[PDB]
Design a protein around this nucleic acid. Structure first.
Ligand SMILES: NC(=O)c1cc2cc(Br)c(C(F)(F)F)nc2nc1N
Ligand SMILES: [Zn+2]
Length: 573
DNA sequence: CATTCCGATAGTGGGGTCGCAATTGT
DNA sequence: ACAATTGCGACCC
DNA sequence: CACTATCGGAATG
C-alpha cells in the first residue's frame, strides 16, 4: 500500500537522524539515507496529497549515494578541423544542424516528476552516477519546480553545470582573503563544488546551468525537433543558451564555429568547442550510438593553447599486456589552467618521429583542452648537453626480454606471469570501474598485495580478511573492513563485466559485451571453436584466436573456476 | 579478386577536488 | 584523548 | 579525459 510505503520510508529516515543526533556523529555515514530521501521524494510527488508537514522532505550531512540512468549519458566524438567536420557530415548523409556552445563544466542529469525536481546525478560510467541532488538544489538557475503546460509525468533534463569567470574569480578572492584553498580553473572548480558533502558550501559557489538534452521522458507533448524541445524547456523556466542556432548546411556550421571562436573572450564563461547535432529526433534514432558516443553529434574543438617546457627524463612504464609505454617527465609548466608535469610519448616510433632527446625543449598543449601531448621538439633551442632516449631491451621491472613483432609498433615485456608490473596492472584492471568495480582497491594497496605476495590471481582478492589487510602501509581497521565489504558486494557482476575483467587480449569492454550477448553463457563461450567465434559481429581471426587460446590453457580455466568458487556470479540469461 | 581505406575499439597515457580514514600533532 | 593534517582513491574533465 | 595502433569489414579499381 502507498500509506504503508510512505511510513516505512519516513521511519527509517527518522531512525537515521536519531542515530545521528545520539552519537553526535559528524554525518549520517550510510548511503541508504540519501537513497531513501530520493525514494520518498519520488513517492510523495507521485502522491502529493499524502505529504505530511513534518515529513523528512519538508525539513545532517550524509554520505553520497548513486543513481542509475536507464538512458545512458555518453560522450561526444571530437572533430578538430573543417575537413574532419566535412567527413562527419558525409558519414551522416551516407547512413538540419542544431549548433550549440560546448560549455566547459560537468554533465548533470536532473529528473523532474510531475514538474517537481526529484534527483540530480553526475555521468559516472554512463549507467550509474553519483547522487548530487542536495548540491544541485542550491543552484539558483535550476528551478525546484517547472511551470506551464504539458509538463511530462517524467522528464530528465540533461545539461552542463559550470562556474562563470566572475564567480570563479569571486571564490578565489574569498580563498585569498581567508587563507582558503585557491582553485586552478573554472572547469575543475565546478566539479569539486558539486561534490561537496555539505550543500551549504556548494551554495556559496555561483554555479549556473544550461540545458542541452533529455534523458527519460514519459508523457507531455514535446516536438520531434531538438531545438524545439530546448525552446519548450525555456517556456518551463529552465536556462537555455541564447546562442543555440539552426544551420542548414555544413558551410553555415563552419561560419558558426568561426563566429563562436571570435566571440570566445566575451562570453563570460569557458567553453571547449561547439557541439553540432542532427536536429531531428527521428534522424537521431536512425543514426544510433557507437559504444562510447552518438553518431549524430560531434564536438567541434578549437585549437589547443601551446606552451614550452623541457623534458627532464623519459621513463618506460609496463602495462598489463606487457606493453612498454614511454612517458616524458617535463619541467612543470602551466597550460590552460592546470600544471603539466608529464605526457605520454606513445612508442619508440613516435620518439623517433619527434627526434626527442632528454634535455630537449618541447612545445606542449592540452590535447582537446584536456590531456598533455608533446607536439614537437624545438631543435634550435636544443642544449649542448642532451641524452639519447634508449628504449628498454629488458623489462625495467622484472628483467625479461622485450620483444617487438615485425611491422608492429608496441614492444612488450615477455615475462608474462613472472612480471610484477604485469601482475599489478592486471589486478588494477580486474578491479576497475567498468570491470569488477571494487571501491578502494587502488595502485598502492595493489602494489603491496603483490609485493608482499599475498595475491597471485584474482580469486585471491576474495580470500583476504580484514586482519590480513589492517597490517598494510596506510591501511587500518576501518579501511580494511571497507575493502572486505567492497570485495563482497562486487561478487554480483554481469557476464560482460566478468569477461572484460579477465583481460583477454583484444577483448575489451565492447567486445566483451559482444561475446556475452552472442554466447549467452560461459560454457557456450568456452566450447566455441575459432570458427563459431568468427560469427560474432566484429570478431575476426585475431579476436577469435585470443579468445580460443585463452580458454584453452588450464591455468586460465582455473583462475575462473576459482573466482566462481569464491562466489562471483551473474544472472542466468 | 587484391588492395587500400575507414569506422570503431583496445590499451595505453594526465590533472584537479574532495571524502574518508591513517597518521602526525597538541 | 581528540584535533589537525594528509595519503589514497573515487570521480570530474 | 585524448591519442592512435590495431582490428574487422567496407570501399576501391
Ligand atoms: N558540454 C556541452 O555543453 C554539451 C554537451 C553535450 C553532451 C552530449 Br552526450 C550531447 C548529446 F547531444 F549527445 F546529448 N550534447 C551536448 N550538448 C552540449 N551543448
Ligand atoms: Zn616485466
Amino acid at each position: 500500500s502507498i500509506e504503508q510505503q510512505l511510513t516505512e520510508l519516513r521511519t527509517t529516515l527518522r531512525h537515521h537522524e536519531y542515530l545521528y543526533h545520539v552519537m553526535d556523529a559528524p554525518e549520517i555515514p550510510d548511503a541508504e539515507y540519501d537513497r531513501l530521501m530520493r525514494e520518498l521524494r519520488e513517492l510523495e510527488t507521485k502522491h502529493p496529497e499524502l505529504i505530511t508537514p513534518d515529513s523528512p522532505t519538508q525539513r545532517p550531512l550524509a554520505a553520497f549515494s548513486q543513481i542509475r540512468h536507464e538512458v545512458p549519458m555518453l560522450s561526444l566524438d571530437n572533430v578538430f578541423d573543417e575537413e574532419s567536420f566535412l567527413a562527419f557530415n558525409k558519414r551522416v548523409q551516407d547512413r538540419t544542424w542544431c549548433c550549440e556552445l560546448k560549455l566547459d563544466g560537468l554533465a548533470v542529469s536532473i529528473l523532474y516528476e510531475n514538474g517537481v525536481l526529484v534527483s540530480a546525478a553526475t555521468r559516472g560510467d554512463g549507467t550509474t552516477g553519483e547522487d548530487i541532488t542536495s548540491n544541485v538544489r542550491t543552484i539558483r538557475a535550476i528551478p525546484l519546480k517547472l511551470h506551464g503546460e504539458n509538463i511530462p509525468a517524467r522528464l530528465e533534463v540533461r545539461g552542463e553545470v559550470f562556474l562563470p569567470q566572475a564567480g570563479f574569480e569571486k571564490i578565489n578572492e574569498d580563498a585569498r582573503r581567508t587563507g582558503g584553498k585557491v582553485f586552478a580553473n573554472p572547469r575543475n572548480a565546478a566539479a569539486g563544488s558539486l561534490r561537496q558533502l555539505d550543500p551549504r558550501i556548494t551554495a556559496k559557489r555561483p554555479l549556473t546551468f544550461f540545458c542541452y538534452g533529455v534523458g527519460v521522458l514519459e508523457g507531455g507533448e514535446l516536438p520531434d525537433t531538438h531545438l524545439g524541445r530546448l525552446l519548450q524547456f525555456k517556456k518551463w523556466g529552465l536556462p537555455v543558451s541564447d546562442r543555440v542556432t539552426l544551420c542548414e548546411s555544413a558551410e553555415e556550421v563552419l561560419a558558426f564555429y568561426h563566429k563562436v571562436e571570435e566571440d570566445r573572450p566575451t562570453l563570460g564563461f569557458d567553453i571547449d568547442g561547439v557541439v553540432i547535432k542532427v536536429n531531428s529526433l527521428a534522424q537521431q534514432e536512425q543514426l544510433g550510438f557507437v559504444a562510447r558516443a552518438p553518431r549524430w553529434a560531434v564536438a567541434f574543438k578549437f585549437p589547443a593553447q601551446e606552451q614550452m617546457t623541457f623534458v627532464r627524463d623519459v621513463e618506460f612504464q609496463v602495462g598489463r599486456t606487457g606493453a612498454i609505454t614511454p612517458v616524458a617527465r617535463l619541467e612543470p609548466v602551466h597550460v590552460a589552467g592546470v600544471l603539466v608535469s608529464n605526457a605520454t610519448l606513445h612508442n619508440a616510433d613516435e620518439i623517433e618521429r619527434l627526434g626527442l632527446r632528454i634535455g630537449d625543449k618541447v612545445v606542449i598543449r592540452r590535447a582537446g583542452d584536456v590531456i598533455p601531448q608533446v607536439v614537437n621538439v624545438v631543435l634550435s633551442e636544443r642544449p649542448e648537453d642532451t641524452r639519447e632516449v634508449v628504449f628498454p631491451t629488458h623489462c625495467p621491472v622484472c628483467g625479461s626480454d622485450v620483444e617487438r613483432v615485425e611491422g608492429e609498433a608496441v614492444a612488450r615485456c615477455t615475462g608474462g606471469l613472472i612480471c610484477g608490473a604485469q601482475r599489478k596492472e592486471s589486478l588494477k584492471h580486474f578491479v576497475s570501474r567498468r570491470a569488477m568495480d571494487v571501491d578502494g582497491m587502488g595502485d598502492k594497496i595493489i602494489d603491496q598485495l603483490v609485493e608482499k605476495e599475498y595475491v597471485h590471481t584474482p580469486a585471491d582478492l576474495f580470500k583476504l580478511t580484514a586482519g590480513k589487510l589492517t597490517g598494510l602501509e596506510r591501511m587500518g581497521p576501518k579501511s580494511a573492513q571497507n575493502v572486505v565489504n567492497a570485495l563482497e558486494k562486487a561478487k554480483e557482476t554481469t557476464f560482460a563485466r566478468f569477461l572484460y575483467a579477465l583481460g583477454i587480449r583484444e577483448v575489451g569492454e565492447a567486445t566483451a559485451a559482444g561475446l556475452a550477448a552472442y554466447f549467452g553463457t560461459l560454457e557456450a563461450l568456452e566450447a566455441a571453436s575459432i570458427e563459431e567465434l568468427q560469427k560474432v559481429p566484429d570478431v575476426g581471426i585475431v579476436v577469435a584466436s585470443h579468445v580460443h587460446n585463452f580458454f584453452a590453457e588450464e591455468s586460465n580455466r582455473n583462475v575462473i573456476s576459482e573466482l566462481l568458487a569464491e562466489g562471483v556470479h551473474w544472472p542466468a540469461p
